[PDB]
Design a binder for this molecule. Structure first.
Ligand SMILES: CC(=O)SCCNC(=O)CCNC(=O)[C@H](O)C(C)(C)COP(=O)(O)OP(=O)(O)OC[C@H]1O[C@@H](n2cnc3c(N)ncnc32)[C@H](O)[C@@H]1OP(=O)(O)O
Ligand SMILES: C[C@H]1O[C@@H](n2cnc3c(N)ncnc32)[C@H](O)[C@@H]1O
Ligand code: MET
Ligand code: SF4
Ligand SMILES: [Mg+2]
Ligand SMILES: [Mg+2]
Ligand SMILES: [Mg+2]
Ligand SMILES: [Mg+2]
Lengths: 42, 538
RNA sequence: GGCCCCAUGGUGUAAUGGUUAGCACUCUGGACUUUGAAUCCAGCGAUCCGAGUUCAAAUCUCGGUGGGACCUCCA
């Protein structure tokens, strides 16, 4: 559940930033937290 | 009571500072101020002057390089003291019936007890009013203020302001000059020559004096008289290069007289600074650009310094009556900023701009300039347009160090030659090319065929200025983080002595100088003759 | 001794769990070779201290430290 939630949050943030790029730092923490989750799973 | 709390806060601040100095660690002043003010329950913060005014003597000596205030006041290498004369009437009141059409204040005006071209509400004006126009008191008071700030007053230069100084009786001028010299040295003299001798032997060096004068009061007599006083700089108001403007404003002279006075003064050995005024009547927005282009391209006009004074309309003058009648209108602020930017883009690299606008208080002005920082607005506009200013003031080490954060790296030697006022001028300098940073300069001129002084006839070349910038280094001291006492002066004189012998073909070299400079040039190998320091080149 | 509430820049004060705290007095610097103190324009400076709950706390739970209200006790 944590992996799914944080990955969907990362996807939402990434899509928002991408839409800003075409129109024109939560992602870092989300990526690090997902890395920690995968590390615990390992 | 807040007073003793303030005193205890101050004492604690110096206690921490001196302790940190004793065990030798760096300390941040603002955080200490805030923390210490928090303890004793205050609603304000300490001031720098108060902290300076409570240091013990030896610590006062040691820890000023951390508590100094307003570092600009000695960022050019000297300390400037401004004094004013006695109120009087301008000389051309008689044979014309009136004075310039735009000059405010004076003996016959509603500004009580004020000098001509001033209102009396200015900083220097209020200093001399309470001193009742006494040079000794003014000099002492200003030096006391400068020392209280935390600066070094080893090297001093005077500026005499007011109306036309050289139109006063001889006795008053004697009194004024000898009192200035005595105030510096500490002697009690009777006439000019005694004061000059004692000031030559003094320890608080008098670098030079500056006087403001009119073109019709700059002749051989007046030039010799100013030479005996120790003066080395002149300020003349040109205001325009157009002949119709010089007579529609009741100026009282002509432009040709200005050019002739320039020629005489430069051959005698002085330095020339010119006052100019944009936005004069009958001068549109297109004649100003042509005016200044001719000013800086025509050899008859090229000065050494400039003062830009945009026209202001003030009550009680003829221009005020013109403005009320709906016949004169000022520029719009955007147009004025654009014009000033364009003008500043034209200044040659050998010219220094001292000031950019007047200092009249805003409520007294009926129309004209209203802001107070025209220079920096103009610089920002210039950055927007893509052009750059390359005068002397905005290229020296101190200004480049406080406005930007740069330091010289690759110093080189530069020489520029030109023709001006019928003479062959050279300008030597040490500067960094890549970052555009100036360090030291020297001016040299070959005497023309119309020199009248006895000491300069027969093949003499004259040096008009030598200067090295940075912060002030006291005499006989050295500071490896500053730029003055590191040998840039004897390098600039050795080159001036080679041009004057192998290229000018002269057989003697002369220097106009102050008094501490007299001792310096005696150290180099020059002797004294008249008011000059001379040396044989054969 | 229990008993309810208060704490953000040096001082007076604003703001709703978002993805980064706004104003006033004070202070410092420049235009300025006519000026520490005036004018114009820039700048520095804060969620007391611990645990925490919620994806996330200045913000909500429980604490210590000070303060304010009730009687203290006490001698
Ligand atoms: C002549 C004129 O019109 S004025 C000269 C300019 N006026 C000024 O003082 C403003 C700044 N001036 C300066 O930088 C210097 O005073 C200059 C221009 C005279 C010489 O510049 P510098 O590069 O510093 O000189 P330099 O390093 O070659 O000489 C250093 C020596 O000069 C001495 N010196 C400097 N100024 C003076 C002075 N006014 N009187 C006597 N000696 C002096 C120093 O004490 C030092 O002597 P020491 O170290 O052997 O004891
Ligand atoms: C002292 C200097 O002030 C300048 N000056 C004199 N009157 C005015 C004015 N009304 N507005 C602007 N500058 C003025 C002149 O250039 C003079 O030389
Ligand atoms: C103080 S005004 C400038 C000096 C002199 N009065 C002149 O008009 O040239
Ligand atoms: S000569 Fe100078 S001081 Fe005298 S009235 Fe004219 S502008 Fe003013
Ligand atoms: Mg508070
Ligand atoms: Mg509040
Ligand atoms: Mg709140
Ligand atoms: Mg200020």
């Amino acid at each position: 559940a944590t992996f799914s939630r944080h990955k969907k949050r990362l996807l939402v943030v990434r899509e928002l930033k991408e839409q800003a790029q075409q129109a024109g730092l939560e992602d870092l923490a989300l990526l690090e937290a997902l890395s920690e989750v995968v590390q615990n799973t390992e | 009571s807040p007073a003793e709390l303030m005193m205890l806060t101050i004492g604690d601040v110096i206690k921490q500072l001196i302790e940190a100095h004793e065990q030798g660690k760096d300390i941040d002043l603002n955080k200490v101020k805030t923390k210490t003010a928090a303890k004793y329950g205050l609603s304000a913060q300490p001031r720098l002057v108060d902290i300076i005014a409570a240091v013990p003597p030896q610590y006062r000596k040691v820890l000023m390089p951390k508590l100094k205030a307003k570092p600009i006041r000695t960022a050019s290498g000297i300390a400037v003291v401004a004094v004013m004369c006695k109120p009087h009437r301008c000389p051309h009141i008689s044979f014309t019936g009136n004075i310039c059409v735009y000059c405010p204040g004076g003996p016959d005006s509603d500004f009580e007890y004020s000098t001509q071209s001033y209102t009396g509400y200015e900083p220097t004006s209020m200093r001399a009013i309470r001193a009742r126009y006494d040079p000794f008191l003014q000099t002492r008071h200003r030096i006391e203020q400068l020392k209280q700030l935390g600066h070094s007053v080893d090297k001093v230069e005077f500026i005499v302001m007011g109306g036309t100084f050289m139109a006063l009786p001889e006795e008053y001028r004697d009194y004024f000059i000898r009192n200035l010299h005595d105030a510096l040295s500490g002697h009690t003299s009777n006439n000019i020559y005694e004061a000059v001798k004692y000031s030559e032997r003094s320890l608080t060096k008098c670098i030079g004096i500056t006087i403001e004068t009119r073109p019709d009061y700059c002749m051989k007599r007046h030039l010799s008289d100013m030479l005996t006083y120790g003066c080395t700089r002149l300020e003349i108001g040109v205001q325009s290069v157009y002949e119709d403007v010089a007579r529609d404003t009741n100026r009282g002279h002509t432009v040709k007289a200005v050019c002739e006075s320039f020629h005489l003064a430069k051959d005698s050995g002085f330095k020339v600074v010119a006052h100019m005024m944009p936005d004069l009547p009958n001068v549109g927005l297109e004649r100003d650009i042509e005016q200044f282009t001719e000013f800086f391209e025509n050899p008859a006009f090229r000065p050494d310094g400039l003062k830009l004074y945009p026209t202001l309309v003030i009550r009680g003058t003829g221009l005020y009556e013109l403005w009320k009648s709906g016949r004169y209108k000022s520029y719009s602020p955007s147009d004025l900023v654009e014009l000033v930017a364009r003008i500043l883009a034209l200044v040659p690299p050998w010219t220094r701009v001292y000031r950019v606008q007047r200092d009249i208080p805003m409520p007294l002005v009926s129309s004209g300039v209203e802001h107070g920082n025209l220079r920096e607005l103009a610089l920002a506009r210039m950055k927007d347009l893509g052009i750059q200013c390359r005068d002397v003031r905005t290229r020296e080490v101190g200004i480049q160090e406080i406005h930007h954060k740069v330091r010289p790296y690759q110093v080189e030697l530069v020489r520029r030659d030109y023709v001006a006022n019928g003479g062959w001028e050279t300008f030597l300098s040490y500067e960094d090319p890549d970052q555009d940073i100036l360090i030291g300069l020297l001016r040299l001129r070959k005497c023309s065929e119309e020199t009248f002084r006895f000491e300069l006839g027969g093949g003499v070349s004259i040096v008009r200025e030598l200067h090295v910038y940075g912060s002030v280094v006291p005499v006989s001291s050295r500071d490896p983080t500053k730029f003055q006492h590191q040998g840039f002066g004897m390098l600039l004189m050795e080159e001036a002595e080679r041009i004057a012998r192998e290229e000018h073909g002269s057989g003697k070299i002369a220097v106009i100088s102050g008094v501490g400079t007299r001792n310096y040039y005696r150290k180099i190998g020059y002797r004294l003759q008249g008011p000059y320091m001379v040396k044989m080149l054969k």
